Design an enzyme around this catalytic site. Sequence first.
Site, PDB file in Angstrom:
ATOM      1  N   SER A  45       0.761  -1.245   0.000  1.00 11.94           N
ATOM      2  CA  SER A  45       0.000   0.000   0.000  1.00 11.94           C
ATOM      3  C   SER A  45       0.792   1.295   0.000  1.00 11.94           C
ATOM      4  O   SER A  45       0.190   2.335  -0.239  1.00 11.94           O
ATOM      5  CB  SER A  45      -0.972   0.011   1.208  1.00 11.94           C
ATOM      6  OG  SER A  45      -1.796  -1.163   1.181  1.00 11.94           O
ATOM      7  N   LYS A  48       0.096   3.749  -2.879  1.00 12.56           N
ATOM      8  CA  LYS A  48      -1.105   4.569  -2.930  1.00 12.56           C
ATOM      9  C   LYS A  48      -0.812   6.061  -2.822  1.00 12.56           C
ATOM     10  O   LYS A  48      -1.529   6.897  -3.396  1.00 12.56           O
ATOM     11  CB  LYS A  48      -2.051   4.072  -1.825  1.00 12.56           C
ATOM     12  CG  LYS A  48      -2.711   2.742  -2.184  1.00 12.56           C
ATOM     13  CD  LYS A  48      -3.473   2.136  -1.031  1.00 12.56           C
ATOM     14  CE  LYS A  48      -3.838   0.701  -1.424  1.00 12.56           C
ATOM     15  NZ  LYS A  48      -4.211  -0.122  -0.275  1.00 12.56           N
ATOM     16  N   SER A 105      -6.148   2.895   3.579  1.00 11.88           N
ATOM     17  CA  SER A 105      -5.561   1.857   2.749  1.00 11.88           C
ATOM     18  C   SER A 105      -6.588   0.956   2.034  1.00 11.88           C
ATOM     19  O   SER A 105      -6.381  -0.220   1.750  1.00 11.88           O
ATOM     20  CB  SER A 105      -4.618   1.024   3.617  1.00 11.88           C
ATOM     21  OG  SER A 105      -3.537   0.593   2.842  1.00 11.88           O
ATOM     22  N   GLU A 141      -4.705  -4.369  -7.007  1.00 15.36           N
ATOM     23  CA  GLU A 141      -4.991  -4.912  -5.696  1.00 15.36           C
ATOM     24  C   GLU A 141      -5.904  -6.122  -5.857  1.00 15.36           C
ATOM     25  O   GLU A 141      -6.812  -6.084  -6.700  1.00 15.36           O
ATOM     26  CB  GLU A 141      -5.695  -3.884  -4.820  1.00 15.36           C
ATOM     27  CG  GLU A 141      -4.768  -2.789  -4.387  1.00 15.36           C
ATOM     28  CD  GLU A 141      -3.763  -3.169  -3.309  1.00 15.36           C
ATOM     29  OE1 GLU A 141      -3.218  -2.241  -2.740  1.00 15.36           O
ATOM     30  OE2 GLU A 141      -3.539  -4.334  -2.984  1.00 15.36           O
ATOM     31  N   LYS A 209       2.485   6.491   5.333  1.00 11.66           N
ATOM     32  CA  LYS A 209       1.606   5.531   4.695  1.00 11.66           C
ATOM     33  C   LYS A 209       2.316   4.196   4.887  1.00 11.66           C
ATOM     34  O   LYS A 209       3.473   4.017   4.490  1.00 11.66           O
ATOM     35  CB  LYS A 209       1.433   5.825   3.162  1.00 11.66           C
ATOM     36  CG  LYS A 209       0.669   4.670   2.462  1.00 11.66           C
ATOM     37  CD  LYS A 209      -0.826   4.825   2.742  1.00 11.66           C
ATOM     38  CE  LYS A 209      -1.680   3.593   2.450  1.00 11.66           C
ATOM     39  NZ  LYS A 209      -1.710   2.792   3.646  1.00 11.66           N
ATOM     40  N   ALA A 212       1.200  -3.727   4.176  1.00  8.54           N
ATOM     41  CA  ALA A 212       1.665  -5.050   4.526  1.00  8.54           C
ATOM     42  C   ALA A 212       1.323  -5.955   3.358  1.00  8.54           C
ATOM     43  O   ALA A 212       0.488  -5.642   2.504  1.00  8.54           O
ATOM     44  CB  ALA A 212       0.979  -5.599   5.760  1.00  8.54           C
TER      45      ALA A 212
END
Length: 263
Positions: A45, A48, A105, A141, A209, A212
């Site tokens: 993440s 992002k 996230s 994702e 930010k 995982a």
Amino acid sequence: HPETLVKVKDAEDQLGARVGYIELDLNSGKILESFRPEERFPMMSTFKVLLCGAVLSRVDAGQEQLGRRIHYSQNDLVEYSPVTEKHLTDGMTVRELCSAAITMSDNTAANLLLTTIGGPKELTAFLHNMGDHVTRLDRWEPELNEAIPNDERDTTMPAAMATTLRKLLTGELLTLASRQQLIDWMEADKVAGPLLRSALPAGWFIADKAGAGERGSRGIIAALGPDGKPSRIVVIYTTGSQATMDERNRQIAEIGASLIKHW
């Protein structure tokens, strides 16, 4: 300071995995301290931030509007979608999707904004165009968190990510009101409490930010500083550990604790 490097090697020993770490002066771009600065780590993440950077550059080019509403269905929903799963009836504006993707996230918000942009290849072209010839986004994702050993897909290097973040936040690539908007989202991060924020002294500034993934991956990018103003970028990534989310969190917070102790 080298005592922080002691703690980073200690975390590799505790986690039994590689830790990439860099500390970068925000103003001059001077690398202050590093460990595995040019090895590749999965972004997870932390990409992002870069995605909402590409979106805001389009908004400054008059190519996208922050108020534009995107309507998606239950079919777009992937795992870890706290905010988007709740706004299925009425949709969400680009502003809300970038706020959800950074602050919470939210994974579907990221996929939605990636379609806008033209997908992974177009975020990677945007990165290439700003001098970053290392970071690359390849998948959507949740597949980009797979973290296959030695796979270059969806990876960055601590040094490339640190330098890209500095450019995004202080360079002429984004309008100042856009840089500020990106910083605001990162500062409103809700889901990084046990990492660097648990070590931050009172009154200090943090915009960050975390991410995982599979195979023990964990990482965080952050602009932080004393007296309510950022003056350093810190990037920390790990992958390969068999330790619990809690042990990986603890180790990153202790690395925060020594970098703050030795500021």
